[PDB]
Amino acid sequence: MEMEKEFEQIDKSGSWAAIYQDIRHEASDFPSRVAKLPKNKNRNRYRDVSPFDHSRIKLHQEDNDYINASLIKMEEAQRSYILTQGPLPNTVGHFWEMVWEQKSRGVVMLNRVMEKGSLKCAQYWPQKEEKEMIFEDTNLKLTLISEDIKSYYTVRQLELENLTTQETREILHFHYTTWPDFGVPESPASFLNFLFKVRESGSLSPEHGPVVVHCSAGIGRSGTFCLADTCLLLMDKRKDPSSVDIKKVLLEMRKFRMGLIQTADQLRFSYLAVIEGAKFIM
């Protein structure tokens, strides 16, 4: 079926939970043996969210190459994304090592450091120009260059230096700051505006390594971001845009990381975002 009318048909019939449970039943199951090794317990935020072995990002290190991060490679859309958990106190150096090694231009953050009164990820970037951060375990230096605070999101320019070679690179930090502590946003307008700002920066384009996107677990809000982006790109590329099937695209993405889209409300929000986005594109 088309999307907008499939949408109203699920709303009128109140069957979002049944649609979402079908997706969960049909989703891929692949091994995640490296994630479950005992030496990696303090590298995982949640025991039930792990990268598959076949698609995990490897650190270029011989001691321990493990990080909780996955490469989502979308062949028809010609887009790639790295989805990862919010960094932990003992993985902030690994996180920036990955950004460096994968040649990423941008980092997309969809959570606040504290939500619901608890810590959802480490404070992993510097908050003042004159107070830079040094990650001694991976030999990197990170400096805040500039910050632009808007009503729904903040964009930061960062300098990452490889202290071994003295090479430097400019990284863009795109921080969506207004996702509610509970539920999903009422309107997708600010989320779509944010997606378009990431696109306009070049961070999603083939002349760079894959964008790094995270929330707390790296599957819910993060899944919503890449699902909406890929669906809108396919609607632009194909002769018949009504052939784009968001459930099929989501199942394709779940070949590369488990659990993408965590609730039926996140599924409905993803439909809403793609529907409204497709009208603005033209």
Ligand X SMILES: CC(C)(CO)NC(=O)c1cccc(Cl)c1
Please give the annotated binding residues for substrate, written as ranges. Answer: 181, 215-221, 262
**Cα gap 61→15, rounded to integer Å:** 47
What is the rounded radius of gyration, in angstroms, for the C-alpha atoms of the chain?
Answer: 19
Residue least distant from ligand X (Cβ)? 169
CB 51 within 8 A of CB 66: no
**Cα gap 115→182, rounded to integer Å:** 9
CB 4 within 8 A of CB 275: yes
Phi then psi for 205, rounded to 5 degrees?
-95, 160
Q: Which is nearer to ligand X, 162 or 201 (CB)?
A: 162
**Cα gap 174→158, rounded to integer Å:** 11
Site for ligand X in 196-255 (CB under 6 A): 196
Give me the 245-264 binding string for ligand X, x by CB under 6 A, dash otherwise: --------------------
Binding part of the chain for ligand X, among 31-39, 110-118, 145-153, 190-198 by CB under 6 A, reads 190-198
Give me the 94-133 binding string for ligand X, x by CB under 6 A, dash otherwise: ---x--x--x-x----------------------------
Q: Which residue in this structure is represented by tokens 């965590």? A: 262
CA 274 vs. chain centroid, Å, equals: 17
Q: How far is the CB of 141 from ligand X (least distance, A)?
A: 9
Please confirm, yes or no, whether 231 is among the known catalytic residues.
no
Q: How far is the CB of 106 from ligand X (least distance, A)?
A: 9
Catalytic residues: 215
Residues lying near ligand X in the complex (CB under 6 A): 60-61, 97, 100, 103, 105, 137-140, 162-164, 169-170, 192-193, 196, 277, 280-281
